[PDB]
């Protein structure tokens, strides 16, 4: 499984687009979207994610570097089409290898949903979808910040 | 929600029946049982389990002292009436306080299913049933390990 640490994420049907909190926004119900590269190496911290695991299970919690708020399902609303927000709480996440290559999927556990992409147009917020074998709007790559 | 540590677990309908592993046997896919209180004060490390906690969240994992099995439904089939047993790898649980004391649910994490036993006779197989928040068979009182 993933290693835990800090991570810039890009989704891998629109490889110009990382995962992005509004604004540097610290309030409650904050969109998370997709957009350009903010800044070079590796962005600003809305830009950056920290991955806590449970061991021995592929169970996470995602915190933005700064501000420091975590992802969440808007109002815990566990449904097809619900917004990704920033908030002072998580929503628990299932992050799952898709074969030998590097890609994985965000699922949410037990219910057949995961996080989506879906225009290429810059500022598009991310929402869950049902999971496929054959989507890549629905698949992400992680590299690392070295940082400091 | 309950603190990391070590716990005998007792069923709320009938306070005569501790959570076991069947014969304290290492064995993969052994059924996990209520039985009567094997040693005095605390039992041997087959009714004796320990509780790892992902931090901002209810989402634990279970694992007996001797041998080291971690708690599992068989075959990871989430569905009414599933069998619980012993195994190298977890199911992740979600465990909340309800009734009303040092009484709590343990729940499959985003389903209406639930650990329950459904008879007093000695030794009857723990397994899954439906959610129901009039039902003491699927209520658990939670006691630390005395510090021998
Ligand atoms: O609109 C999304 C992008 O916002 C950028 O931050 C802006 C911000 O929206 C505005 O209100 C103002 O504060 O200027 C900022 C830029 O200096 C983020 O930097 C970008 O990553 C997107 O979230
Ligand atoms: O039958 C369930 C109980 O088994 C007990 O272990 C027995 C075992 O069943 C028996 O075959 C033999 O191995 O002697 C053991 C007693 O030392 C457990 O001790 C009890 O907790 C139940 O799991």
Same mark, same amino acid.
């Given at each position: 499984?993933?290693? !835990?640490?800090?991570?810039?994420?890009?989704?891998?049907?629109?490889?110009?687009?990382?995962?992005?909190?509004?604004?540097?926004?610290?309030?409650?119900?904050?969109?998370?979207?997709?957009?350009?590269?903010?800044?070079?190496?590796?962005?600003?911290?809305?830009?950056?994610?920290?991955?806590?695991?449970?061991?021995?299970?592929?169970?996470?919690?995602?915190?933005?570097?700064? !501000?420091?708020?975590?992802?969440?399902?808007?109002?815990?609303?566990?449904?097809?089409?619900?917004?990704?927000?920033?908030?002072?709480?998580?929503?628990?996440?299932?992050?799952?290898?898709?074969?030998?290559?590097?890609? =994985?999927?965000?699922?949410?556990?037990?219910?057949?949903?995961?996080?989506?992409?879906?225009?290429?147009?810059?500022?598009?917020?991310?929402?869950?979808?049902?999971?496929?074998?054959?989507?890549?709007?629905?698949?992400?790559? =992680?590299?690392?910040?070295?940082?400091?």
């Amino acid at each position: 499984s993933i290693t !835990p640490g800090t991570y810039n994420i890009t989704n891998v049907a629109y490889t110009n687009r990382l995962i992005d909190l509004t604004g540097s926004n610290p309030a409650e119900n904050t969109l998370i979207i997709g957009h350009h590269l903010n800044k070079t190496p590796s962005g600003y911290g809305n830009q950056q994610w920290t991955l806590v695991q449970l061991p021995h299970t592929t169970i996470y919690t995602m915190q933005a570097v700064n !501000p420091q708020s975590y992802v969440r399902v808007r109002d815990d609303n566990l449904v097809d089409g619900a917004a990704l927000v920033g908030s002072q709480q998580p929503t628990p996440v299932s992050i799952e290898s898709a074969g030998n290559s590097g890609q =994985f999927r965000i699922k949410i556990p037990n219910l057949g949903l995961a996080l989506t992409l879906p225009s290429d147009a810059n500022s598009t917020p991310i929402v869950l979808g049902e999971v496929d074998e054959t989507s890549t709007n629905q698949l992400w790559a =992680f590299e690392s910040v070295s940082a400091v």
